[PDB]
């Protein structure tokens, strides 16, 4: 059991980074020991899971302990997002905070470790960050429970016919990381045409399909970064193009153009899907280098948006603090507008970026004219190339043309149809 958590780790102001390689037992071994200690010492304790799947991991890992799981117990377990979103309103307090997967660059995750770091720094609580890749450390090839042979090869970027026999002549199960759902679909179509069984994991398919992997044992799992954390794919090979889709504010809009190179922490998680078992050798096949400079991504603005509205002078976790795009408190809203912000996040599935721009600028919680009164360049097109139309309750035909344009609302795991429900005032 890691050295720095024998005792004194639970002391107000203590920040414990556990740099623990993948498969090393952060979730199923170390966490139950930290909770057993916290409960014996009667310390009110917060546990933060990135995702529902890691939360369900924790429910098994903390089976037979007095713990309350959130969607007469002093340990609260919830998702990073749940914590931050609740703090946007009679807030609860804990004196120990344990964050699992504390590398995650989801804006709720950056915001939560920022708030907890700030509290720690003011002696309000003790903080434990657990991850294979602490923020600041640049290490794509961390340690494994078993050997991984890592090799650079050219990897197909879409459909292919000949020239990559090593993909289909492999005898074990593979996980192939792809930068988008669309790129995922084209890889999966080719693999199935080559007679392979394939399950696609992404935000649209996960809750139905993740549990199928264990059972069906497909030749391939074609997955986005959704599988970077707490996903057990039980594969012997990862194929990793080392790309991701990059949400970025460009000329006042959020775009999803093109690909960025992954961060070391992402490459490590992707490689981390294999080498989980000693006495087995697994493969990690990759293409090209990593890039730890993700400062231009909208996630940092979205993290500050969330952090400024859940708060001394609050900062990001120290290593990430260079990436706060504005002076602390810049994005704080009035109470009344934070209420609107929280509604749009929790009930309308808005990005933090869009929810902030709407709540800061719009007169009423009932106004929808912002969805059609944007500049002509912001008009949203259907697949067939026609501009999306819908009807306000008075029967007026509108073209979807939002003042604030976030491409994430109209592709890659969200549908135009759900935004139209909101724009037409059905919400």
The residues that touch ligand ADP, with contacts defined as CB under 6 A, are 20, 22-29, 32
27 touching Mn ion, by CB under 5 A: yes
The nearest distance, CB 320 to ligand ADP, in angstroms, is 21
Phi and psi based region of residue 385 (left: phi greater than 0; alpha: psi -120 to 50; beta: remaining): left
Considering the complex, state which of residue 29 and residue 347 has its C-beta at the smaller distance from ligand ADP: 29
Piece of the chain touching Mn ion by CB under 5 A; list 19-27, 172-180, 300-308, 347-355: 19-27
Piece of the chain touching Mn ion by CB under 5 A; list 26-34, 62-70, 262-270, 316-324: 26-34
Task: Tell me the residue length of the chain.
Answer: 427
Considering the complex, state which of residue 273 and residue 401 has its C-beta at the smaller distance from ligand ADP: 273
Give the DSSP per-residue string, 1-43: --GGGSSSTTSTT-EEEEE--TTSSIIIIIHHHHHHHHHHTT-
* Partner interacting with residue 24 (select from Mn ion, ligand ADP, none; CB below 5-8 Å by kind): ligand ADP
Q: How far is Cα 171 from Cα 205, in angstroms, rounded to an integer?
A: 26
The nearest distance, CB 104 to ligand ADP, in angstroms, is 13
Considering the complex, state which of residue 26 and residue 323 has its C-beta at the smaller distance from ligand ADP: 26
Which residues are within 8 A (CB) of 162 and not within 5 positions of it... i.e. 6 or more apart? Answer: none
The nearest distance, CB 19 to ligand ADP, in angstroms, is 11
Considering the complex, state which of residue 100 and residue 302 has its C-beta at the smaller distance from ligand ADP: 100
26 touching Mn ion, by CB under 5 A: yes
Give the DSSP per-residue string, 253-265: EEE--S-EEPPHH
Which residues are within 8 A (CB) of 235 and not within 5 positions of it... i.e. 6 or more apart? Answer: 172, 173, 174, 175, 221, 273, 274, 282
Which residues are within 8 A (CB) of 270 and not within 5 positions of it... i.e. 6 or more apart? Answer: 177, 228, 238, 240, 242, 262, 284
The answer to whether residues 3 and 19 touch, using CB atoms and an 8 Å cutoff, is: no
- Integer Rg of the chain from CA: 22
Q: Name the residue with the smallest CB distance to ligand ADP.
A: 26
Helix (H) or strand (E) holding 303: helix 299-308
Q: Name the residue with the smallest CB distance to Mn ion.
A: 27
* Partner interacting with residue 28 (select from ligand ADP, Mn ion, none; CB below 5-8 Å by kind): ligand ADP
Nearest to 286 by CA among 309, 304, 266: 266
The nearest distance, CB 225 to Mn ion, in angstroms, is 16
The nearest distance, CB 175 to Mn ion, in angstroms, is 16
The nearest distance, CB 29 to ligand ADP, in angstroms, is 4
* Partner interacting with residue 20 (select from ligand ADP, Mn ion, none; CB below 5-8 Å by kind): ligand ADP
Question: Strand pairing partners for 69?
Answer: 77
* Partner interacting with residue 142 (select from ligand ADP, Mn ion, none; CB below 5-8 Å by kind): none
DSSP 408: G
- Whose tokens are 């190179």? That residue is 261
Considering the complex, state which of residue 28 and residue 391 has its C-beta at the smaller distance from ligand ADP: 28
Considering the complex, state which of residue 167 and residue 221 has its C-beta at the smaller distance from ligand ADP: 221
Cβ atoms within 10 Å of 233's Cβ, excluding its own:
20
Considering the complex, state which of residue 284 and residue 410 has its C-beta at the smaller distance from ligand ADP: 284
| Count of residues near Mn ion by CB under 5 A | 2
The nearest distance, CB 164 to ligand ADP, in angstroms, is 30
Considering the complex, state which of residue 58 and residue 188 has its C-beta at the smaller distance from ligand ADP: 58
The nearest distance, CB 282 to ligand ADP, in angstroms, is 15
Dihedral pair phi/psi, residue 304, rounded to 5° = -70, -45
Give the interface with Mn ion as residue ranges (CB under 5 A).
26-27
């Amino acid at each position: 059991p890691q050295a720095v958590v024998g005792t004194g780790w639970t002391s107000k102001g203590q920040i414990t980074v556990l740099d623990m390689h993948p498969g090393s037992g952060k979730t199923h071994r170390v966490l139950p020991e930290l909770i057993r200690q916290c409960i014996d010492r009667r310390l009110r304790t917060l546990v933060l899971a990135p995702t529902r799947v890691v939360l369900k991991e924790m429910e098994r890992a903390l089976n037979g302990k007095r713990v309350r799981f959130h969607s007469g117990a002093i340990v609260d377990v919830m998702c990073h997002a749940t914590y931050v979103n609740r703090r946007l309103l009679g807030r609860q307090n804990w004196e120990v905070a344990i964050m699992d997967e504390a590398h995650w660059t989801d804006p709720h995750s950056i915001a939560a470790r920022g708030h907890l770091y700030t509290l720690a720094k003011e002696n309000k609580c003790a903080l434990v960050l657990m991850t294979a890749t602490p923020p600041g450390k640049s290490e794509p090839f961390p340690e494994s429970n078993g050997a991984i042979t890592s090799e650079e090869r050219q990897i197909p970027d879409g459909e292919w016919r000949d020239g990559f026999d090593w993909i289909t002549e492999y005898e074990g199960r593979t996980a192939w990381f792809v930068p988008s759902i669309a790129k995922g679909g084209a890889i999966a179509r080719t693999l199935r045409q080559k007679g392979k069984s394939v399950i696609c994991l992404n935000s649209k398919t996960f809750e139905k399909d993740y549990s199928r992997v264990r059972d069906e044992k497909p030749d391939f799992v074609v997955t986005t970064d959704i599988s970077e954390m707490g996903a057990n794919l039980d594969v012997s090979r990862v194929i990793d193009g080392r790309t991701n889709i990059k949400p970025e504010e460009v000329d006042g809009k959020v775009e999803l153009t093109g690909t960025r190179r992954v961060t070391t922490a992402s490459a490590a998680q992707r490689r981390g899907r294999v080498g989980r078992q000693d006495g087995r050798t697994d493969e990690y096949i990759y293409s090209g280098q990593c890039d730890d400079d993700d400062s231009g991504l909208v996630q940092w603005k979205e993290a500050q948006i969330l952090l400024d509205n859940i708060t001394p002078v609050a900062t990001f976790y120290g290593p990430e603090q260079d990436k706060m795009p504005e002076v602390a408190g810049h994005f704080r809203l009035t109470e009344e507008k934070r209420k609107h912000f929280r509604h749009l996040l929790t009930h309308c599935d808005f990005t933090p970026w869009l929810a902030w721009h709407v709540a800061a600028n719009v007169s009423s919680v009932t106004d929808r004219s912002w969805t059609w009164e944007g500049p002509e360049a912001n008009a949203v097109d259907e697949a067939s190339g026609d501009l999306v139309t819908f009807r306000s309750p008075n029967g007026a035909e509108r073209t979807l043309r939002p003042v604030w344009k976030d491409a994430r609302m109209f592709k890659e795991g969200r549908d135009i149809k759900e935004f139209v429900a909101y724009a037409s005032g059905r919400r």
